[PDB]
Write an enzyme that holds these catalytic residues in place. Structure first.
Site, PDB file in Angstrom:
ATOM      1  CB  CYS A 181      -0.945   0.009   1.202  1.00  0.00           C
ATOM      2  SG  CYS A 181      -1.919   1.519   1.377  1.00  0.00           S
ATOM      3  NE  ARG A 226       2.861   0.848   3.460  1.00  0.00           N
ATOM      4  CZ  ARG A 226       3.888   0.015   3.491  1.00  0.00           C
ATOM      5  NH1 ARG A 226       4.088  -0.752   4.555  1.00  0.00           N
ATOM      6  NH2 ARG A 226       4.712  -0.051   2.463  1.00  0.00           N
ATOM      7  CD  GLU A 248      -5.842   2.463  -6.295  1.00  0.00           C
ATOM      8  OE1 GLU A 248      -6.318   1.349  -5.932  1.00  0.00           O
ATOM      9  OE2 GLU A 248      -5.812   3.483  -5.534  1.00  0.00           O
TER      10      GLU A 248
END
Ligand code: HEM
Ligand code: HEM
Ligand SMILES: Clc1cccc(CCCNCCc2ccnc(-n3ccnc3)n2)c1
Ligand SMILES: Clc1cccc(CCCNCCc2ccnc(-n3ccnc3)n2)c1
Ligand SMILES: C[C@H](O)[C@H](O)[C@H]1CNc2nc(N)[nH]c(=O)c2N1
Ligand SMILES: C[C@H](O)[C@H](O)[C@H]1CNc2nc(N)[nH]c(=O)c2N1
Ligand SMILES: [Zn+2]
Lengths: 407, 411
Positions: B108, B111, B285
């Protein structure tokens, strides 16, 4: 222990058995992966030779034959006697082709069996080394129709008599630190550009000055040599859309030739073994041109494209990056100099992967390096699982010569 | 032992000690690296050491290591384990647990935000309808009218593995995918199998290009049940491009809340198999993977056509060119509609600072380079040039098999 790798775009699964011949270590452990880390005697020698000769003789379908056993004994006799041994021309070519084949960071390996090997083991002086390199450069360039080639200088003896090409590539642009605080030319070469001057180079302090060759033979002090300009093919960088692009004053050289690596074959070490192929477009356009610690030209190009550089979210850096790479490919294609785009290259690499899995049981590959530094996920290799491991023969890294050279 | 990582663009070198606290395995060995491999019931026997190790961390973080409160708790948990074969986490421990599993999520990039996570405790949930209610409140809290807030909802832990809570959707909000008889696909190709299940379970599909999938919820080991998320709770963004007016006519939209619902949260040996979490989107994404992946919406062609790109040779870089514009359109649209989103430059830059901070204050930051580097323009983001170490800390988010392969159907 019989591993599978999956392509997630095509669902193709390949099985890997070749990894069960890997001998050298990866840097990883069961507890920690070092995948993105850039660098993680007489009795030593014979098993190494034996492993190599076994592969070689199996590759020519005379595994366990007379000749095989004969050669095994012959080399064994020589090692005990001379503390080293010499490769037969056949073994040398095979070794070199397979070192390329095994290079898990090279995307161009589909070409591996079409390598021209120049045997320079009879070389004794830097002038000799210079001559051999010029011949390599001229042969490989081939007026823009590039052919892959390697030139192999004599093998290490006692590490006191090492042949080395001090340059990291046969053909690179110079690097000058200014009183201004800024940096003119290639900043990756600033220090090398220095040592050229300390040993005697008469730098013309320009932006794209082709560096001199700095050659070390038999452990001796290295010598400077200017490559004949007529042998250094260069491409002026223009854009098939932006007339202003030429005013940027950008050019690049056509021959990509790695000269600082160490070729290991059957235990023997070749510390001077310059090799060359042809450029993937992104190597120049993305990395050489756009890296912050390199020519770093993004701001200039974006400024010239009149983009809103107020916000990272406009993707102006991305926009420029593409155009630049369009130009690079365009300029090379227009001057008829071999170049491959990242789409074609990666596509070819996937094919090569399928061939290697089929005809050899695997293909070591370092995803972090195979995936291009732009448009990663729109190239096939992004979605391709790869297994990374070290096979021999190999190209290894080795310390920069200045840190080791006994002056 | 100490391990050094180097940033080759800045020459900054960091020292990792944190990796010594790692027990789980990477998939790698001394002889093979599986760094690009995507995917390389528990007795009281193994459970209490796991509990101790967790509670030890917890109590250290709150600066009460060796305290009476600490020792009493260890005692309490031990006694509860042998009596009952398991144990229950305090609210404090659950919160700490969930944050730290995000913190340890080496894949990820977001974070830096780890300490700001809204944790919703759903361990009192007993039925699918109860799960739907909890999920709605999550979607509404996290969405916040476009000003997104990170959140996780945590349903009861696994007991014997025959009573699992599971969210069958891979993500709380995703679009249907339909295989047509002609072999082409309508909508999102990645959701074909799951859409088929829903239809089978009784979902009436509009059969469009952007149909918000229904929720398929499994409580306490029972067969899953269908629920439709109230449309007014599903924030969506029409995709338009700031210069290309024909772009709106592609008929593209996406949802604003990115929410992973198929992972497993491990805290102190306990397994939370339903733990949907949400953040906000990094532009790529959607722009790169959702739209441009060949196995997804795959709009590169239609987009490039309308750009009048030379599509005859790949060395025109028409694909790369279209990709950028599409990603420009996505960020543009989200910002225009004031829905939270982050571009890959901004996000990777923040992650580098986060990482540097984590080395200084924690002694490490596990990170998966293969995943952290954005799927476009890799080397013009600073993470490309960043050496990373990957290892596995607990608490953690893990993959688990899709529930349709494992579920024992009641009927
Ligand atoms: C002929 C077409 C070739 C292509 C398109 C190609 C492509 C590439 C690329 C893109 C890289 C990454 C370099 C970087 O990012 O620094 C690379 C590295 C490498 N290549 Fe090639 N290559 C070719 C020929 C060769 C040949 C002829 C050899 C040796 C005989 C070779 C051996 C290697 C090795 C050992 C590396 C790793 C270099 C390093 O670790 O720094 N390649 N190649
Ligand atoms: C708030 C903004 C956030 C951003 C920008 C962000 C960014 C990302 C991205 C880009 C990925 C890669 C996804 C993929 O390519 O498949 C990812 C993965 C992941 N994220 Fe986040 N994230 C955020 C919040 C969170 C939160 C709140 C959690 C958990 C509480 C979380 C946990 C994870 C985990 C466990 C993965 C690995 C997913 C997998 O392996 O499939 N992230 N993150
Ligand atoms: Cl280990 C580490 C740390 C910092 C820099 C570094 C340089 C890697 C450069 N790799 C060589 C690049 C290069 C240049 C010209 N040609 C090629 N080339 C030619 C054929 N195949 C590759 N390759 C390594
Ligand atoms: Cl191992 C493996 C093999 C094939 C596909 C796969 C799916 C990866 C999905 N990753 C989650 C993508 C996603 C979607 C929405 N939101 C987020 N998200 C939210 C906060 N952080 C990430 N992430 C795994
Ligand atoms: C830190 C990371 O390992 C480093 O930036 C790598 C990433 N991948 C690369 N890939 C290629 N082809 N060449 C490189 O120099 C690098 N550098
Ligand atoms: C095979 C390869 O590891 C796989 O395609 C990975 C590469 N990196 C990724 N990175 C992110 N963020 N998300 C992904 O799904 C993937 N896929
Ligand atoms: Zn590894």
């Amino acid at each position: 222990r019989f591993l599978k790798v999956k392509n997630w775009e095509t669902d193709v699964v390949l099985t890997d058995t070749l990894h069960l011949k890997s001998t050298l270590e990866t840097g990883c452990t069961e507890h920690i992966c070092m995948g993105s880390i850039m660098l993680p005697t007489k009795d030593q020698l014979f098993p190494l030779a034996k492993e190599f000769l076994d592969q070689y003789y199996s590759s020519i379908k005379r595994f366990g034959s007379k000749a095989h056993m004969d050669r095994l004994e012959e080399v064994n006799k020589e090692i005990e006697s001379t503390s080293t041994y010499q490769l037969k021309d056949t073994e040398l070519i095979y070794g070199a082709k397979h070192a390329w084949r095994n290079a898990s960071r090279c995307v161009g390996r589909i070409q591996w069996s079409k390598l021209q090997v120049f045997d320079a083991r009879d070389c004794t002086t830097a002038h000799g080394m210079f001559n051999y390199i010029c011949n390599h450069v001229k042969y490989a360039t081939n007026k823009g129709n590039l052919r892959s080639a390697i030139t192999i200088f004599p093998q290490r003896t006692d590490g006191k008599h090492d042949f080395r090409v001090w340059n990291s590539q046969l053909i690179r642009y110079a690097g000058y630190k200014q009183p201004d605080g800024s940096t003119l030319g290639d900043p990756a070469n600033v220090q090398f550009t220095e040592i050229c001057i300390q040993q005697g180079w008469k730098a013309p302090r320009g932006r794209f000055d082709v560096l001199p060759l700095l050659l070390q033979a038999n452990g001796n002090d290295p010598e400077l040599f200017q490559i004949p300009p007529e042998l250094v093919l260069e491409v002026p960088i223009r854009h098939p859309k932006f007339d202003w692009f030429k005013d940027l004053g950008l050019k690049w050289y056509g021959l990509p030739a790695v000269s600082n690596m160490l070729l290991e074959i059957g235990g023997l070490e070749f510390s001077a073994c310059p090799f060359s192929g042809w450029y993937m477009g992104t190597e120049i356009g993305v990395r050489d041109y756009c890296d912050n610690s390199r020519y770093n030209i993004l701001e200039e190009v974006a400024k010239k494209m009149d983009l809103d550089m107020r916000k990272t979210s406009s993707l102006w850096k991305d926009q420029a990056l593409v155009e630049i790479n369009i130009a690079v490919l365009y300029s090379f294609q227009s001057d008829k100099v071999t170049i491959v785009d990242h789409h074609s290259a990666t596509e070819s690499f996937i094919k090569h992967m399928e061939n290697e899995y089929r005809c050899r049981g695997g293909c070591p590959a370092d995803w972090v390096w195979i995936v291009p530094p732009m448009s990663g996920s729109i190239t096939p290799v992004f979605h391709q699982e790869m297994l990374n491991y070290r096979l021999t023969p190999s190209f290894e890294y080795q310390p920069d010569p200045w840190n080791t050279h006994v002056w």
